[PDB]
């Protein structure tokens, strides 16, 4: 009865496509035509965080918009004071193959993970004043590519075993397992209300999950290669993805389909990171071509370039107050742009 | 200027000194290597001595030294069959050890395809490969037995002739020499089709009781680093 089920799935897909086409009343490019252009976004490197002696794979800003944590293949997890360039902490890592790092919204914890298939939680605030592994979250059967904190006790992680997970930090077990992706999940972004989150996998699909129920609410398919980055719009009703096809695409949750495409024939290098500004008007994407592009989320016309990295840009983050953008790269430096 | 600012600066200076010392200690005579291959290949048994496990479930690390020079060899074990993503984490290793089961003609084309993707990968273009054509004893047994014909899997073997530069073993059969050098050339044609000059392939015929693999890796890493230095100093 495989043929009958396949036909049922095909007609369901046809119905979904017809519904999306019916809901496709207009286009974002058409509606935003009258919008005044942003202009020329000139961002200059304000500070350069030196101290990493190897390729840099991830970073995450703090909720206070001043402290940020970075990860590298040298085995160090440095918490930086972006205001004064001072290194607040330097956490050695057991495994040098970490691919992600997170900073807890409360600021008391820092997480990291990589090819060890383990998310390690580090207690920044200790009575003895030192940093050490609080707990190690095990259970993923593939490399862990992204982890984001909901609070001091709950963390959502994505892994290369095609599954996202929600963890109970105190208990140390997976409260919820999210399944449905058919490829390695590369990146996960949380909603402003932390009730929903989206993930980008290596099947050119982005899925909306429900944190409490653990079900895939919606699926978005508009990419032609693996998605490497994802980020909710500040409103929380949309998100943007960056894929290996050298293209950013902005999807709407309520409209259930893609809105606008950010690509050009000049760019052929894949995208490694995306992020929005505080207003959501500017979409910043990091590419493999050694620099970044400051897109326009509405007009879809490139409005700036963040050049000044001597290798592939692996990570990119914007402060919660929008004051600064920190981009890390394989040349072992972080640059704060403003 | 403030007391808190001075204390923070002193802490930062101590941190920076600690990282500088750690980096100098870690980068001194230590070369990282990635062991790749299939399950049938004796990748776990390439380097015999110093199989010092440091497994974290995901990666089995082996450390060994030849002549006062330390080598770290990683074996990514606990991952899905898809590898186009986590292979980019190994784009700065000095060399890649590729292990091939020579006697297995069924999966030899799969091994060749894997070798060509690594070779032509964007992030692995500058990394040399130390190709270890394992199970030469079994390959010789297969050639002497003659039950399985390598021409069925590679039709161009009929028109193949043993290279002049071959160095056969004294007790080796000409058919075995032709077969092993045929496999070696199949790999080397792929290597030379797109090698850009920044990386090379170093093939070696090994068995299950070979104890010279560590020395071979030492010598090929020395050659790789010497060629890199010559290229950097515009001497090559």
């Amino acid at each position, epitope marked *: 009865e495989l043929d009958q089920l396949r036909q049922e799935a095909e007609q369901l897909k046809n119905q979904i496509r017809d519904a999306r086409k019916a809901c496709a009343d207009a286009t974002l490019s058409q509606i935003t035509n009258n919008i005044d252009p942003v202009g020329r976004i000139q961002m200059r490197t304000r500070r350069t965080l030196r101290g990493h002696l190897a390729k840099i794979y991830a970073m995450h800003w703090g909720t206070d918009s001043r402290l940020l944590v970075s990860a590298s293949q040298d085995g160090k997890l440095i918490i930086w004071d972006s205001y004064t360039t001072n290194k607040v902490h330097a956490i050695p890592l057991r495994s040098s193959w970490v691919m992600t790092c997170a900073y807890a919204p409360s600021g008391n914890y820092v997480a990291c993970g990589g090819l060890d298939n383990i998310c390690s939680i580090y207690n920044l605030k200790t009575r003895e004043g030192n940093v050490r592994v609080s707990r190690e979250l095990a259970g993923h059967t593939g490399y862990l590519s992204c982890c984001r904190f909901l609070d001091d006790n709950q963390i959502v992680t994505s892994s290369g075993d095609t599954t996202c997970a929600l963890w109970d930090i105190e208990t140390g077990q997976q409260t919820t397992t999210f399944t449905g992706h058919t490829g390695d999940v590369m990146s996960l972004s949380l909603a402003p209300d932390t009730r929903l989150f989206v993930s980008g996998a290596c099947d050119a699909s982005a899925k909306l999950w429900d944190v409490r129920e653990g079900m895939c609410r919606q699926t978005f398919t508009g990419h032609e290669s693996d998605i490497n980055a994802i980020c909710f719009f500040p409103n929380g009703n949309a998100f943007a993805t960056g894929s290996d*096809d050298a293209t950013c695409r902005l999807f709407d949750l309520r409209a259930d389909q893609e809105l606008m495409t950010y690509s050009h024939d000049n760019i052929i290098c*894949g995208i490694t990171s995306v992020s929005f500004s505080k207003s959501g008007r500017l979409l910043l994407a990091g590419y493999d071509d050694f620099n970044c592009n400051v897109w326009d989320a509405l007009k879809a016309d490139r409005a700036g370039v963040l050049a000044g990295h001597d290798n592939r840009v692996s990570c990119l983050g914007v402060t919660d107050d929008g004051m600064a953008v920190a981009t890390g790269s394989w040349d072992s430096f972080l640059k704060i742009w403003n | 200027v403030s007391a808190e600012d001075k204390a923070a600066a002193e802490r930062s200076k101590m941190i920076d000194k600690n990282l500088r010392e750690d980096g100098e200690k870690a980068a001194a005579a230590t070369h990282r290597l990635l062991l790749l291959g299939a399950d049938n290949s004796g990748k776990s048994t390439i380097v015999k001595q110093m199989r010092i496990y440091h497994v974290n479930s995901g990666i089995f690390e082996t450390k060994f030294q030849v002549d006062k020079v330390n080598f770290h060899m990683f074996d990514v074990g606990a991952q899905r*069959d898809e590898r*186009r993503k986590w292979i980019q984490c190994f784009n700065d290793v000095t060399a890649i050890i590729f292990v091939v089961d020579s006697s297995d003609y069924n999966r030899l084309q799969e091994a060749l395809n894997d070798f060509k993707s690594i070779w032509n990968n964007r992030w692995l273009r500058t990394i040399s490969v130390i190709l270890f054509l394992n199970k030469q004893d079994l390959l010789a047994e297969k050639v002497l037995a003659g039950k399985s014909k390598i021409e069925d*899997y590679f039709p161009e073997f009929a028109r193949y002739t043993t290279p002049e530069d071959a160095t056969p073993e004294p007790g080796e059969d000409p058919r075995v020499t032709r077969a092993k050098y045929f496999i070696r050339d199949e790999f080397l044609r792929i290597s030379t089709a797109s090698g850009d000059g920044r990386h090379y392939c170093y093939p070696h015929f090994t068995c299950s009781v070979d104890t010279e693999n560590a020395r071979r890796i030492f010598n090929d890493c020395r050659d790789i680093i010497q060629r890199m230095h010559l290229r950097q100093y515009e001497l090559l």
Partner: nanobody
Amino acid sequence: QVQLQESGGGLVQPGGSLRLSCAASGFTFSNYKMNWVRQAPGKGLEWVSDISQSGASISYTGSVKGRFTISRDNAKNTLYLQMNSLKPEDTAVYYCARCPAPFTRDCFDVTSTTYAYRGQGTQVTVS
């Protein structure tokens, strides 16, 4: 949505011929190298042939070299495989597959168990 719907296949006598097709949609066909993969019963997936973006660089597996001929039609976004002079060892489900990334000569995960950018498959049997 990226999908690769195939066609062709069916019963054929030994020494017969078949022409498999691949309707590619959802992506720029001219940008990606394309492959042909088959899975014999009781065996894993085996790469058969591939063709570059332009169509100049073409390679085949040794067991099918000379007989099979892959051709791509970038205008119509279709991939073909002229399967003439068939043998009973060629009975397999033939999947079309494309390399994960554009503008690349490397194709890591094509014969994977759960590859995403591959077709549903075409049942080819020889009797």
